[PDB]
Amino acid sequence: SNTIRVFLPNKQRTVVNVRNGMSLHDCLMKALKVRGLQPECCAVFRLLHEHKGKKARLDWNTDAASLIGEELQVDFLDHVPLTTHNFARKTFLKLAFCDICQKFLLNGFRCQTCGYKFHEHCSTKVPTMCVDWS
Amino acid sequence: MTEYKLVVVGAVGVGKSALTIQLIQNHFVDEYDPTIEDSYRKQVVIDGETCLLDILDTAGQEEYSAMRDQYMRTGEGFLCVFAINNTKSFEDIHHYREQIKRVKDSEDVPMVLVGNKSDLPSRTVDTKQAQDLARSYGIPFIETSAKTRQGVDDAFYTLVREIRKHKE
Ligand SMILES: Nc1nc2c(ncn2[C@@H]2O[C@H](COP(=O)(O)OP(=O)(O)NP(=O)(O)O)[C@@H](O)[C@H]2O)c(=O)[nH]1
Ligand SMILES: [Cl-]
Ligand SMILES: [Cl-]
Ligand SMILES: [Mg+2]
Numbered sequence: 253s254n255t256i257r258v259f260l261p262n263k264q265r266t267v268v269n270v271r272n273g274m275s276l277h278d279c280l281m282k283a284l285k286v287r288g289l290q291p292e293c294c295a296v297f298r299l300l301h302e303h304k305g306k307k308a309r310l311d312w313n314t315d316a317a318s319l320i321g322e323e324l325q326v327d328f329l330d331h332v333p334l335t336t337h338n339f340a341r342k343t344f345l346k347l348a349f350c351d352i353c354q355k356f357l358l359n360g361f362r363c364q365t366c367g368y369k370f371h372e373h374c375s376t377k378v379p380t381m382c383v384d385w386s
Numbered sequence: 387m388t389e390y391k392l393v394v395v396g397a398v399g400v401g402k403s404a405l406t407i408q409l410i411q412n413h414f415v416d417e418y419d420p421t422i423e424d425s426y427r428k429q430v431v432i433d434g435e436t437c438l439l440d441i442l443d444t445a446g447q448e449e450y451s452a453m454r455d456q457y458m459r460t461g462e463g464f465l466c467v468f469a470i471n472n473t474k475s476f477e478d479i480h481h482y483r484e485q486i487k488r489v490k491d492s493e494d495v496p497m498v499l500v501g502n503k504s505d506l507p508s509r510t511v512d513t514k515q516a517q518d519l520a521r522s523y524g525i526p527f528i529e530t531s532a533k534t535r536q537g538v539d540d541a542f543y544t545l546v547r548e549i550r551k552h553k554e
């Protein structure tokens with residue numbers, strides 16, 4: 253009962269207990285970094301189930317105890333260069349190397365947005381967010 | 387892209403969070419922090435097919451004997467995880483096995499019994515016990531470890547493979 257559920261970007265969610273005095277940034281910094289999400293590229297909102305607007309923006313360093321019981325939501329800032337990968341099969345005719353284990357890559361997969369090439373058994377080591385500054 | 391609803395259940399301190407965090411950001415968290423409800427989504431390539439994994443890290447605590455029945459319904463695969471350093475979690479697998487199969491109404495539920503913390507020298511449960519228990523449920527067995535990353539892939543990979551074998 254002493255917790256707050258927060259909906260995270262990319263249709264994710266977390267529930268954290270509030271050591272009072274902690275800010276919203278302190279309680280959610282661990283849950284964002286483990287998901288490949290940069291806190292500097294995120295905003296925390298309070299979900300408004302009411303009319304005319306679904307959420308209102310909140311300060312990151314506000315007291316987390318002041319929002320116990322409500323449902324918060326973290327979203328990416330406007331037009332941040334973070335998206336989801338777009339993998340596809342690729343056979344490397346010329347000798348290429350994996351971006352994860354730095355071994356010989358023959359039949360692997362590459363992202364059509366950032367160019368992340370990797371062995372299939374290394375696809376779990378690719379970052380979860382796609383950085384796109386093209 | 388095909389999504390797979392995955393649910394990781396187990397006892398307290400078994401290693402459910404350390405396994406998913408190593409699967410998600412290729413990292414290992416040493417200091418222990420209990421899970422209440424954590425959802426993760428990541429694209430993983432399984433047998434040449436790039437699919438999305440909606441992993442749900444659940445609470446091993448018995449304080450949530452109500453929300454457990456909810457997410458066990460909408461889940462497609464289940465990771466029955468236990469630590470070989472604790473023999474109470476090995477027998478508690480039957481409780482998680484029967485409670486999931488109850489809200490599934492099917493003896494054939496896509497699960498895989500995995501054994502974590504294989505790097506510790508304080509091994510209490512050997513492979514002979516888990517291999518026969520895996521034969522008792524008809525599910526594969528994967529010996530894992532969150533630190534050395536021993537077969538952390540093959541745990542989630544074989545779980546999605548059973549979901550694929552279960553469908554068609
Ligand atoms: N040596 C070793 N330690 C591990 C391994 N996996 C987890 N641990 C450690 O044992 C504990 C497991 O913590 P955690 O993964 O949070 O377990 P949990 O099942 O997630 N806990 P909870 O259910 O309460 O949320 C932590 O101290 C972690 O660092 C492993 O494979 N080897
Ligand atoms: Cl969301
Ligand atoms: Cl889910
Ligand atoms: Mg946990």
Ligand SMILES: [Zn+2]
Pocket residue numbers: 336337338363364365366367368381382383
């Ligand atoms: Zn990419």
Ligand SMILES: [Zn+2]
Pocket residue numbers: 350351352353354355370371373374
């Ligand atoms: Zn590789």
